[PDB]
């Protein structure tokens, strides 16, 4: 099931990478029996960073950023939403 993680930004950042489609049109994928449009995913977590300590895990598939749905979004759309957090980030994710 989707879970919600709060990450407070440190002076060095959030400590995670996001990878996903540049443009819309990617393949659909079934997760936990539910069909989803393409989801950007957490591709790396800095050990001991803010995201790591908050419980973000590698492979986490991002459904929402600050309660804005990003299912099927472009990479730039997700990047821009994360940067608009400005010292706090709420991720709704589907972990592997």
């Amino acid at each position: 099931g989707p879970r919600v993680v709060r990450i407070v930004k440190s002076e060095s950042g959030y400590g995670f990478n996001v990878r996903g489609q540049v443009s819309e049109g990617g393949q659909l994928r079934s997760i936990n029996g539910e069909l989803y449009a393409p989801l950007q995913h957490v591709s790396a977590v800095l050990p001991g960073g803010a995201a790591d300590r908050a419980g973000v895990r590698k492979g986490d598939r991002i459904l929402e950023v600050n309660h804005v749905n990003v299912e099927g979004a472009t990479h730039k759309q997700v990047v821009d939403l994360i940067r608009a957090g400005e010292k706090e980030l709420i991720l709704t994710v589907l972990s592997v």
């Binding site: 950042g13 959030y14 400590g15 995670f16 990478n17 996001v18 990878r19 996903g20 489609q21 540049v22 591709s43 995201a51 990479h75 990047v79 994360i82 940067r83």
Partner: peptide, 7 residues
């Protein structure tokens, strides 16, 4: 394609 960004 797939692209990556660091936060």
């Amino acid at each position: 394609d797939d692209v990556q960004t660091s936060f």
